[PDB]
């Protein structure tokens, strides 16, 4: 399956995760894929909050599925 990600710029980044993988595993890909730190990363699907405990197959995520990459709270 080849999912995608929509950043703040809207840019669409293709991913090659699995329906058995996890969200935290997807973002991890967004880290290098884009080269951005997970400190300010948050993958969202169908405009819904995602968890590192959930799964794609559990989120109904499939192939060609586009996610949402937004920012998060400050750091400190």
UniProtKB/Swiss-Prot annotation:
UniProt crosslink position (Glycyl lysine isopeptide (Gly-Lys) (interchain with K-? in acceptor proteins))? 76
Residues the UniProt record annotates as site (Essential for function): 68
User: How does it get modified post-translation?
Assistant: Phosphorylated at Ser-65 by PINK1 during mitophagy. Phosphorylated ubiquitin specifically binds and activates parkin (PRKN), triggering mitophagy. Phosphorylation does not affect E1-mediated E2 charging of ubiquitin but affects discharging of E2 enzymes to form polyubiquitin chains. It also affects deubiquitination by deubiquitinase enzymes such as USP30.
Give every Ubiquitin-like domain span: 1-76
Q: Where in the cell is it found?
A: Cytoplasm; Nucleus
Site annotated as Interacts with activating enzyme: where? Answer: 54, 72
Cross-link Glycyl lysine isopeptide (Lys-Gly) (interchain with G-Cter in ubiquitin) - where? 6, 11, 27, 29, 33, 48, 63
According to the UniProt record, list the residues that bear Phosphoserine: 65
**Superkingdom of this entry's organism?**
Eukaryota
Q: Which residues carry this modification: ADP-ribosylglycine?
A: 76
Q: What does this protein do?
A: Exists either covalently attached to another protein, or free (unanchored). When covalently bound, it is conjugated to target proteins via an isopeptide bond either as a monomer (monoubiquitin), a polymer linked via different Lys residues of the ubiquitin (polyubiquitin chains) or a linear polymer linked via the initiator Met of the ubiquitin (linear polyubiquitin chains).
Task: Indicate what this protein is called per its UniProt record.
Answer: Ubiquitin
Its encoding gene is what? Answer: UBA52
The shown range, given as first to last of full length, is: 1 to 76 of 128
